[PDB]
């Protein structure tokens, strides 16, 4: 439906980010990220997740991928975070088109793998 499909895009769009540095061993990250995951889930059954599902963590989160590598990757506000906080605007867009508006796919489509027309 919504506010848990985007969380399974949110790991291969923040790796798009963390991986952007050519970093294998964030992949390992991704489990971490995960743990986000099960917060922004926790967030629906308080009711606050209607369309903020958890910035905070996911921002969070995101810096601590930067933090397994501590060399050259933004150790405050990187483009890791910077990345999140534009695409979710345009994510929230590609979002509420799938909730009325699926022209196309739906926005990822499974990795443009689903075929179907609306």
Not at 3 to 11: I, K, V
């Amino acid at each position: 439906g919504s506010e848990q499909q985007d969380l399974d895009d949110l790991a291969q769009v923040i790796l798009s980010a963390v991986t952007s540095n050519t970093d294998t061993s964030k992949s390992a990250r991704a489990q971490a990220l995960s743990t986000a995951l099960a917060s922004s889930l926790a967030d629906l059954l308080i009711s606050e997740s209607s369309g903020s599902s958890y910035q905070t963590q996911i921002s969070a989160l995101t810096n601590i991928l930067s933090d397994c590598f501590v060399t050259t990757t933004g150790s405050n506000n990187p483009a890791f975070v910077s990345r999140v906080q534009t695409l979710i605007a345009v994510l929230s867009q590609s979002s509420s088109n799938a909730i009325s508006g699926a022209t196309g796919g739906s926005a990822f489509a499974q990795s443009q793998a689903f075929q179907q027309s609306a």
